[PDB]
């Protein structure tokens, strides 16, 4: 059997580390997966969708929420094709998804660093119209409110999670009257342009500033060029695999099934990016 | 025929072979292929499953990364039988394939030629697994590149590895502890190389003033944010033009299998930092 996977295009995301685990889970079931690459060219990823639904795989499995894809999603749903979505929160459909707990992972990073005495505690954020990030933003705001800390506008810069979003951040951050003695990033790309930028304003990182990430991306790269190694949410991704292939699977063997959504727990690694204080 | 290029990848990982992949779909694009990856997950049953898989029907061809002596009999398999087979940075002996190389030698030549032009006269070099050939083309390079430039070869400023994560640090630390330590080195990858500076930093040292570092891959490049102020110097592998030069191979090879295996290769280009500065 053959199970396709589309994506958008081969990069260093925490997906390298899922791709892997499909390959895993999918020989314990006799399945072989099948990998394409859009190069970020819709139109490439509609021909390789055709190509495995016309017959070189018996499911499709896709990655993300991406509104673009929102028509070829419903299109491919009219049909009875196998498909699995991982992180999809599209509205109107109904379709077997594999989800990660954005807003609680950023509940339990906030709960961590307030268990180590921080309690002026900032963070940077994705796109907020990307469910993930507005998730990320929400779950900071509830943990500031549980634990009994005030929310201030001025500890969350709102980004488009581009590169050197976490310098300009971390700017705006520590020029304040009073800088955050903790910040919790949307993701690990910006913790490191945190802690490079704060080393530049002679910051020392954990000593002046705590820093807690998303992804856990050293994992991926082996390495990260800083001199501290993130504290940062993990993505389940051994558990997302294993659930995504049992979903195909199920569905593979019976057409009657209907759109299960499974959601999984992140889980902090603690890496060197944060201290306790006073 | 399919209109499938398959690839088998011993795994996904962040190397510089992710840009390659990129590239592979689109040229295969402009030949009007589609591109198919797999991954063995390193088991190699897994591998020669994914090879069936493909040579019994799935694609037209073949396309296969490495140099691993274990692939070597599977290898041959393939090239008795027919189908379409391009590798990439292979240098198996003994057979005769279409193969797109890179020029790891003259790359590590162009490393070392750097820094003495920068004034440095006390070079390290920090191996790679040199049974591998492109870790022994690049610690050959650096030892023919001391001799063309005048300097006395050194044993003791050659640190060999099996390339793993750490072995920068622990190489950084022998070569800083020495009585006359490098002004700088040529790592054979840019992880070495970030990990040097790191450990440069923790005992004291600033990175390029107390030591000159040039890396290999520019693995930089599949970073899409900016995690230090110091990027390596590092030589950047053609992977645009080898992805190019695999497809058209793996095209005529489809089309003629009476076209007779070519070998391509490819020279690196030096990437310039911040890691390096001029000594006196």
């Given at each position: 059997?053959?199970?396709?996977?589309?994506?958008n295009?081969?990069?260093?995301?925490?997906?390298?580390?899922?791709?892997?685990?499909?390959?895993?889970?999918?020989?314990?079931?006799?399945?072989?997966?099948?990998?394409?690459?859009?190069?970020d060219?819709y139109?490439?990823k509609s021909?390789?969708?055709?190509?495995?639904?016309?017959?070189?795989?018996?499911?499709?499995?896709l990655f993300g929420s991406d509104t673009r894809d929102k028509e070829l999603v419903k299109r491919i749903?009219?049909?009875?094709?196998?498909?699995?979505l991982?992180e999809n929160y599209f509205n109107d459909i109904?379709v077997?998804?594999?989800?990660?707990?954005?807003?609680?992972?950023?509940?339990?990073?906030?709960?961590?660093?307030?268990?180590?005495?921080?309690?002026?505690?900032?963070?940077?954020?994705g796109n907020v119209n990307h469910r993930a990030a507005l998730?990320?933003?929400?779950?900071?705001?509830?943990?500031?409110?549980?634990?009994?800390?005030?929310?201030?506008?001025?500890?969350?810069?709102?980004?488009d999670?581009?590169?050197?979003?976490?310098?300009?951040?971390?700017?705006?951050?520590?020029?304040?009257?009073?800088?955050?003695?903790?910040?919790?990033?949307?993701?690990?790309?910006?913790?490191?342009?945190?802690?490079?930028?704060?080393?530049?304003?002679?910051?020392?990182?954990?000593?002046?500033?705590?820093?807690?990430?998303?992804?856990?991306?050293?994992?991926?790269?082996?390495?990260?060029?800083?001199?501290?190694?993130?504290?940062?949410?993990?993505?389940?991704?051994?558990?997302?695999?294993?659930?995504?292939?049992?979903?195909?699977?199920?569905?593979?063997?019976?057409?009657?099934?209907?759109?299960?959504?499974?959601?999984?727990?992140?889980?902090?690694?603690?890496?060197?990016?944060?201290?306790?204080?006073?």
């Amino acid at each position: 059997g053959v199970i396709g996977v589309v994506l958008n295009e081969f990069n260093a995301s925490v997906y390298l580390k899922l791709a892997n685990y499909l390959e895993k889970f999918a020989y314990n079931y006799n399945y072989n997966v099948v990998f394409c690459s859009s190069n970020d060219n819709y139109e490439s990823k509609s021909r390789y969708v055709q190509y495995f639904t016309g017959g070189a795989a018996d499911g499709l499995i896709l990655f993300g929420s991406d509104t673009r894809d929102k028509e070829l999603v419903k299109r491919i749903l009219k049909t009875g094709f196998p498909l699995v979505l991982i992180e999809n929160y599209f509205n109107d459909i109904n379709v077997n998804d594999v989800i990660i707990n954005n807003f609680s992972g950023a509940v339990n990073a906030v709960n961590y660093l307030v268990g180590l005495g921080h309690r002026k505690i900032a963070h940077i954020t994705g796109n907020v119209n990307h469910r993930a990030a507005l998730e990320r933003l929400n779950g900071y705001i509830r943990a500031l409110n549980e634990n009994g800390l005030a929310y201030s506008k001025e500890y969350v810069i709102n980004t488009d999670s581009g590169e050197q979003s976490g310098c300009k951040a971390a700017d705006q951050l520590l020029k304040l009257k009073e800088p955050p003695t903790a910040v919790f990033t949307f993701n690990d790309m910006q913790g490191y342009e945190v802690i490079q930028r704060a080393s530049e304003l002679g910051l020392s990182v954990p000593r002046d500033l705590s820093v807690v990430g998303f992804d856990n991306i050293y994992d991926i790269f082996r390495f990260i060029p800083s001199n501290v190694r993130l504290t940062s949410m993990k993505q389940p991704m051994e558990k997302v695999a294993e659930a995504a292939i049992q979903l195909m699977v199920a569905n593979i063997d019976n057409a009657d099934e209907q759109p299960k959504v499974i959601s999984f727990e992140t889980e902090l690694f603690h890496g060197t990016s944060c201290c306790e204080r006073k």
